[PDB]
Amino acid sequence: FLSLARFSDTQYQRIENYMKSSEFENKQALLKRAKEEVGLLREHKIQTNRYTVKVQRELELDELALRALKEDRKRFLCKAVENYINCLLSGEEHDMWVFRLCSLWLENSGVSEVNGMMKRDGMKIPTYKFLPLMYQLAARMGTKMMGGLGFHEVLNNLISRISMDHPHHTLFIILALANANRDEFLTSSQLDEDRTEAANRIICTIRSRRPQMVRSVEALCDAYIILANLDATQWKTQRKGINIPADQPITKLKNLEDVVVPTMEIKVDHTGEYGNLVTIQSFKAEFRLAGGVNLPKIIDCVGSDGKERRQLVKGRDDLRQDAVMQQVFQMCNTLLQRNTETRKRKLTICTYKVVPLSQRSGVLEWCTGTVPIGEFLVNNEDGAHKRYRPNDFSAFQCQKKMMEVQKKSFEEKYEVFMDVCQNFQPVFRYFCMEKFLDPAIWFEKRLAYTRSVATSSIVGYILGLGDRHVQNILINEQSAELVHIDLGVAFEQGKILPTPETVPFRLTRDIVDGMGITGVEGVFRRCCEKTMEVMRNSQETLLTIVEVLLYDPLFDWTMNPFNKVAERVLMRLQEKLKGVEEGTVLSVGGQVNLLIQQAIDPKNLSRLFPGWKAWV
């Protein structure tokens, strides 16, 4: 079944690509010219000579070929969808093809035959196989894909059944979608209104069967929303901690039995009943400020087991982008685990749960057991650079030089950057030396650090992650694996900034030195090549994960009155994945070498923002 389905899918994709090529457009234009010339030759009484018969016959052959091609493409689409259904009805080892099945079904929703077959044979498919793509299904209730009411009703029924079977992984998504204007209500096109109404129908349908659970989850969500909307601008000068005012419902919200903590991932089973999950017990009475213009709020929640779990309620910010980033991070980790080449290398991506709650607010999981890179390296009091190289220039001196040179030209900037790097030697190589005295543990941690750096850099380059200064990277004190936490700007946004980001990822001298004597060559280069090969071998899955856009555009876009920049970013991501750029084919080795050269180039590092700490 899988082999037949894969062959049918490949043939359908080949036909679709041929139909979307410029050659097909040229053939269609020639056919239209032939049609209009035949029409003129028929309206006007003209004798049938050799040329007229030849034109008519070649037109008939072209029409027959086009009709046969369309029918064959439809029969391949039907065969591929049917065989995906058959493979997934009673299969477990082939559960990774649900993304291809959903992509084929959603991209061809206009055909009633595939929708009817999906609602007839695929209606009995287990609901636990759509959880990774649950957000993608939840973003398809818009009416822009007018393929009849049958597709909408079958999609709604499937979503309702999935939510009933696994409410933990669905209620937060539906309420977040339905709470787009909740911040404004507590303190918008036709597509948004229709999606909101569909989400409200889903919520009321679920609450018909689980009223207590639904009302408790929405009460917790509203408490988080009001906490995020709370104005803490008067507490910007306090760092020890500020007591939450009693008027907030979060303080009085305690003892939840049917509510599971969102910031902790839940190991989903094949049974629809959950009775061994950590619930919400109480909330702490103090919260801390993490700094910044937006003033994020850090809160601690006590679970059923009594273990405190730190949470970050990032208000006045759009965390939907971070949710997409975490979903693609999990997809990359799963694909790396699936491939036998990377499974042996144990290539993994450190991920933290992000649970959006509204368009302008949300919550995310706090990372524990990690220390900032900048705090470890360039600390004023006990920094690594100060401790190991007192004679070298201090961080304050480097900052002063960078401040004084930003008003100079390219030559002065390059000269001062080269002088700073001359009088500032890397010190990051001593992290594992001073934290792992046992040589075996020291090398194991160093190897894990190098593999994490390579995988994170490759994925960051693919996703266009640009905000990568010292405070956005966290290193674990036990596993020595870098964790990306900020994710605030990505998708090639650094170029929009006044100081363009000339590097794809952070590969500074400290990072290179900490990888060992071999440097970038060796483990880093081989891991980057393996990650690039894995990403290039699953472009359909990566695009499917990223294609959640164009249906529910996030905030900061489509303002000031098929999204423009969402299609631009999809085009750029596809170009990066295919390695085509402006028509030039690049192998995985060549792309890795080019990325390394760009990242380590002092010319590119000189023009970067002084606060990015390129020398560090």
Partner: peptide, 7 residues
């Protein structure tokens, strides 16, 4: 001084 290049 802020580390990130705010807006």
């Amino acid at each position: 001084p802020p580390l990130s290049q705010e807006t």
